[PDB]
């Protein structure tokens, strides 16, 4: 016998509507011709590459990519009932007074639980049955909302039903029938950049046998 009446949400829209007026988890930006994936508060800014063109196939299908699990545990971001909230900013269609804000949800898979267990296996050193029991307990505590209720079976109540709600084979005449169905590359031939004389010396010697400088000057001024 249950003790209370519980209200648990296992959709996308209902979890998002529950978790509006809350601080987001990611912070994604669509600038012009380049993107940026930052934290809510050195955060990288990407060219149009192929890792992002495969990450974008995991946000039109609202699921977390399996690769990220351990590093999310490293990066101290906020999860929300196993899901994380991607806040997208489209700066191309901004308004004046702020860019166009979307707020989507990404959902865990079996792959995300397996990669979370594989990354648990680094410093824990458990056996297989502990992972079985842990997965069973979490699949109990986090997968509510089950549709276990049986309707009428139409094949036993055939006498109280319309006659052509079923599709059986029929015999036709002598057979039977089922139901089916150049120049710019020439003018830049020797345009290869060289960082320094030492690197040029090493590059011509081994063939016969970022803003790190400013960061270094800043940290050396800090150390004094």
């Amino acid at each position: 016998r249950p003790k209370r009446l519980y209200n648990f949400v296992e959709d996308a829209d209902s979890i998002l509507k529950k978790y509006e007026q809350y601080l987001h988890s990611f912070e994604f930006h669509i600038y012009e011709n380049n993107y940026k994936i930052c934290a809510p508060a050195g955060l990288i800014l990407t060219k149009n590459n192929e890792t992002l063109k495969e990450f974008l196939e995991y946000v039109a299908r609202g699921r977390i990519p399996d690769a990220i699990m351990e590093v999310l545990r490293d990066c101290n971001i906020q999860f929300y009932e196993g899901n994380l909230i991607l806040q997208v900013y489209d700066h191309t269609n901004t308004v004046d007074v702020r860019p166009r804000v979307y707020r989507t949800l990404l959902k865990p898979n079996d792959l995300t639980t397996y990669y979370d267990m594989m990354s648990y296996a680094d410093n824990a050193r458990f056996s297989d049955s502990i992972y079985q029991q842990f997965e069973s307990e979490i699949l109990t505590l986090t997968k509510r909302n089950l549709s276990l209720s049986v309707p009428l079976n139409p094949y036993e109540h055939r006498d109280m039903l319309e006659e052509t709600a079923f599709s059986e084979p029929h015999w036709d005449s002598e057979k039977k029938s089922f139901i089916h169905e150049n120049y710019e590359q020439l003018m830049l031939i020797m345009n290869e950049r060289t960082t320094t004389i030492t690197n040029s010396t090493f590059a011509v010697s081994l063939t016969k046998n970022q803003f790190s400088r400013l960061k270094f000057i800043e940290q050396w001024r800090i150390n004094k």
């Binding site: 020439l186 960082t195 320094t196």
Partner: protein
């Protein structure tokens, strides 16, 4: 090879006559290998496997 355009030519000092080799020559380069380059190689592999041969 020295494509740095800054003063001192990517060298420790700006003399630019003391930091340059004595006898040099032209660096290696290549022209546009577009004609000799094929976008698809597997079609050539099936081409050398499957020929007409009558």
């Amino acid at each position: 090879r020295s494509n740095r355009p800054t003063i001192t030519g990517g060298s420790a000092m700006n003399a630019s006559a003391l930091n340059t080799p004595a006898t040099t020559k032209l660096p290696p380069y290549e022209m546009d290998t577009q004609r000799v380059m094929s976008k698809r190689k597997l079609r050539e592999l099936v081409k050398t496997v499957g020929i007409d041969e009558g």
